[PDB]
Each structure stands twice: as structure tokens, then as C-alpha cells.
Amino acid sequence: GFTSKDTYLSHFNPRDYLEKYYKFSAESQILKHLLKNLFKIFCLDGVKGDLLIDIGSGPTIYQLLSACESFKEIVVTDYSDQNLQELEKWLKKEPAAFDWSPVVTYVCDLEGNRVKGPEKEEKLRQAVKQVLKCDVTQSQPLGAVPLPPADCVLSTLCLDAACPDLPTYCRALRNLGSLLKPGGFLVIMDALKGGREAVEAAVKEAGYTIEWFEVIEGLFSLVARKLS
Ligand SMILES: Cc1ccc2c(c1)cc([C@H]1C[C@H](n3ccnc3CN)CN1C(=O)c1cnc3[nH]ccc3c1)n2Cc1ccc(Cl)cc1
């Protein structure tokens, strides 16, 4: 049930999935829980800095909506071109882009209705600085792009999309660490697909210290810091 780089394919039609799962019953419920958790990480728990890199963004922006409260600069990334195109239609405010309005409104509600949808959308659009290819199996997952050491790497539902075996996952997390300052944050929100202990081993062996781990089969979230 594992995927390797030689077997990986992402959904060819990312738009149909946005329409199905990101329009918000079971899926709406799960998305709400994710969004509440991301609110806590990025607006309460001290995960903040200048530069966040979202690894394996997929075609979605919901995982960045609270994060742009806490990071001036966000880089979104994906191995597959069709996911990057779906992101760019939205960032560039094209008429053909997915309508993230309902989710955006819901996040504005979680944040106390300090702003309305358009203002929140604009804050995210201003924060997203680059849209790039990544390959987590590479020592330099973003290739030659000369980003400075970042404050946070976020990975959401990546195991959920395709699960590598444990040493491959540990190596990916260690490759992602090359993107982080010492002490930089690693935030993972994903599917348990050896369970919690396997995730914890991969995180620790990839050179991070877990601050906390929460169950939110099943979904978890965790925040770790790269060894300092
Ligand atoms: C630390 C981490 C671990 C696993 C990850 C990710 C991060 C990110 C993803 C994948 C899945 C993710 N996705 C696609 C649709 N929705 C989501 C989640 N938002 C996008 N996306 C990638 O952009 C990606 C990155 N680099 C790669 N190199 C070879 C394939 C490949 C895919 N994997 C799935 C995956 C499975 C097996 C293998 Cl060997 C490698 C990756």
C-alpha cells in the first residue's frame, strides 16, 4: 500500500476534487476540524516567522489561511504541474479559479470576524511569494531556488494523498530540514497510514524534536522544531 517515486501520480483533475471535498458532509466535518487545528497552530501556539514553505501543497489554499496571519512570506510547492496551475489560477484571481469563498468565510469566523473574506483573501495573495516544483526525495527539494533558511515547513495531507514507506518518509523529512533554520518549525497535519510511533520515529530520526502531537486510522497534527 506504499507509493514510491516510480509509482507516484497525483489526481489528473484536481478541480473535480476541489468541487467535491472543498466546497463545504463527512468531508465538510473533516475540513472544519483541520481548519480549527490550523487556527490553533498558527494563531495561538507561537508558530510564526518571516518565511513559511508549504511542501506538497496540492491544489488547495485552505491550509494557508490562518498561516498568513503569522508569516509575511509563504512559498507554495508541488511535484505536479496540474496542482500548481490550480493554485496559480486562484492566486492570480482568474475567473476560472476554484471558489474558496465559503472556506475563507469560515476561517474569518474562526478568527473572530476581525476581517471579511476579500480582505483575508488579499492578505493570502500578498503573502504567497513563489509557486514552485518540489521533490521531497531530493537533497535539495526545491532544486536551485536560493531561498534563505525558512522559519516553518508545513506538510498537510501528504501521506493521505500517497504514503511512502517509513525510511522514505524519514528521508523526505530530513531533506525538508535543509530548508529550515536551526530551531525552525515543522508542522504536519496528516493521516495515520505502525501509526503514531512510526511518525514519531521518522520525525525524531530526521533531526527534529516534537513539541506536541495530537489526534484530531485517523488524522493527527504535530509541531516539531529542527535541532538547534
Ligand atoms: C514530507 C512529505 C512526505 C510525503 C509526501 C509529501 C511530503 C508531498 C507528497 C505529495 C502528495 C501531495 N498532495 C497531492 C495532493 N494533495 C497533496 C497533499 N496536500 C503533493 N505531493 C508532492 O508534491 C510530492 C513531493 N515530492 C515528490 N517526490 C516524488 C513524488 C512527490 C510528490 N507526498 C507523497 C509522496 C509519496 C511518495 C513519495 Cl516517494 C514522495 C512523496
UniProtKB/Swiss-Prot annotation:
One of its GO terms (molecular function) is nicotinamide N-methyltransferase activity. The modification N6-acetyllysine is found at K32. Its main location: cytoplasm. Changing R174K: Has no effect on N-methyltransferase activity. S-adenosyl-L-methionine binds at Y17, Y22, G56, Y62, D78, N83, D135, V136, T156. Predominantly expressed in the liver. A lower expression is seen in the kidney, lung, skeletal muscle, placenta and heart. Not detected in the brain or pancreas. It is an enzyme of class 2 (transferase). It holds the Pfam family NNMT_PNMT_TEMT. Keywords: Acetylation, Citrullination, Cytoplasm, Methyltransferase, S-adenosyl-L-methionine, Transferase. It comes from the Eukaryota. GO terms for biological process: methylation; nicotinamide metabolic process; positive regulation of gluconeogenesis; positive regulation of protein deacetylation. PROSITE patterns: NNMT_PNMT_TEMT, SAM_MT_NNMT_PNMT_TEMT. Pathway: Cofactor metabolism; Amino-acid degradation. The modification Citrulline is found at R15, R125, R174. It catalyses: nicotinamide + S-adenosyl-L-methionine = 1-methylnicotinamide + S-adenosyl-L-homocysteine. It is found in: Cytoplasm. Monomer. NCBIfam families: GntF_guanitoxin. Prominently expressed in the stroma of high-grade serous carcinomas. In tumorigenesis, regulates the epigenetic reprograming of cancer cells associated with increased cell migration and metastasis. This is Nicotinamide N-methyltransferase. It comes from Homo sapiens (Human). The gene is NNMT.
